[PDB]
Amino acid sequence: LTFXEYXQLXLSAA
Amino acid sequence: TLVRPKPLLLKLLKSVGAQKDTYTMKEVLFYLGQYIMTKRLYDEKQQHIVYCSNDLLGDLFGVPSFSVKEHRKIYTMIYRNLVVVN
């Protein structure tokens, strides 16, 4: 995963 | 629910183009994600690793590095730079 994909995972759970 | 970034955090968020003083948590995480991505603070090989020791983010978070896998730690570090709005 790219950083933005890791970022997006976290964000989605918020 | 709304949050009020404290001044160093708000400055970071505004540096990517945000104009508000009040945000949802999801917005704060979105802009902070864009900041990390655009300034290329992440490790090239393991892109969940973030290096912030010579950046504003490091002063704000009080750490030289972290991993996106450290969810609770990231929230702890974020929430110290925010007030939850009644």
Resolution (A): 2.0
Whichever domain contains B53, its CATH number is 1.10.245.10
DSSP track, B47-69: TTEEE-TTSHHHHHHT-SEEETT
Please state, in angstroms and rounded to a whole number, the distance separating the CA atoms of residues B44 and B37: 11
Beta bridge pairs of residue B82: B5
Cα distance from N-terminal residue to C-terminal residue, chain A: 19
Asked if residues B22 and B2 have their Cβ atoms less than 8 Å apart, the reply is yes
Place of tokens 């902070």: B32
Chain A CA closest to residue B24: A14
User: What was the experiment behind these coordinates?
Assistant: X-ray
Residue B71, domain extent = 1-86
Please state, in angstroms and rounded to a whole number, the distance separating the CA atoms of residues A7 and B68: 7
Q: Who among B25, B33, B71 is closest to A7 (CB)?
A: B33
User: B5-26 burial by CB neighbour count: b if 16+ within 10 A, else e?
Assistant: beeebbebbeeeebeeeebebe
Widest CA span in chain B: 42
Treating both helix axes as pointing N-terminal to C-terminal, what angle do A3-13 and B25-38 enclose, rounded to 10 degrees?
Answer: 170
Chain A CB within 8 Å of residue B42 CB: yes
Domains held by chain B: number: 1
Asked if residues B85 and B2 have their Cβ atoms less than 8 Å apart, the reply is yes
Place of tokens 């730690």: B73
